[model samples]
Target: GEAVIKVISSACKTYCGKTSPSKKEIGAMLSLLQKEGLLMSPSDLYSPGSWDPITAALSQRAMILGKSGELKTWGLVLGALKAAREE
Candidate 1:
């Protein structure tokens, strides 16, 4: 459906770090480091907390993907990760 990347990317990118926790906390964590809204063809590398939350959700996305088996393309994920690593 329009490339499954959008689903994962949106979940991780659009989470608003507001008063309440996001549907998926990891999503919000990633929304910080992950790309979104322009600049980096996704986003600029925002600051990470004293400890990165992505470490907390490392397996989350992989687990979801493993269970749902919904995506066949990971260029978005892989690319995002590579980009993050650079930041």
Candidate 2:
């Protein structure tokens, strides 16, 4: 289980490095996660040590938006997620 979590987390970080999605995108992800019974509260999403691959993916999507010069949030979130994974 730990390895699965780590792999998923790493995948999340990698995806984040590629793109940053919009709020609508995030909402869709949350909805999907909820349907899968994997949705965590917003507080848990930001909590340290939480297994939040979906959030990480959404953040990555946001980063991609920044790379496109559409948003200014930039690489911070993706960087943080990568650092957390410590690949």
Candidate 3:
């Protein structure tokens, strides 16, 4: 779902900048996001530095999508996923 992916992109923009976040931190975040959207789990095999480029890439996507009014917070994202599942 693009909505769910928007949630993640915005989340990455929020969390993955200025100060570096741990792989554990990102892994946990991705875990929660996946649970919300029935998305795939990130593999433990991923190296620590690997996420920098990915998050950097997605942050730009977030900004572009935000301009298009597709930005969302955790609460909204969860609510949306719940609403979708209910229907």
**Residue-by-residue lDDT tens digits, candidate 2, 1-87:** 443333333323333433443432333323323322335533334445544554454454543343334322223333444566785
User: Which candidate tops TM-score?
Assistant: 2
Please write out the lDDT profile of model 1 over residues 59-78, one tens digit for every residue. Answer: 44543332114221222333
In order, candidate lDDTs are 0.33, 0.38, 0.36
Which scores better on lDDT, 2 or 3? 2
Better of 1 and 3 by lDDT: 3
RMSD of each: 12.7, 10.7, 14.5
Model 2 alpha-carbon drift over 4 Å, by segment: 1-24, 52-83
Give stretches of model 3 more than 4 Å off.
1-28, 31-40, 64-87
Estimate, for each residue in 1-87, the C-alpha lDDT of model 3 and write its tens digit. Answer: 442343344333333321334322333245434433324433311333333433333344544322114334322333333443464
* Prediction 3 TM-score vs. true: 0.25
Work out how many backbone clashes candidate 2 has: 11
Clashes of each: 1, 11, 0
Better of 1 and 3 by TM-score: 3
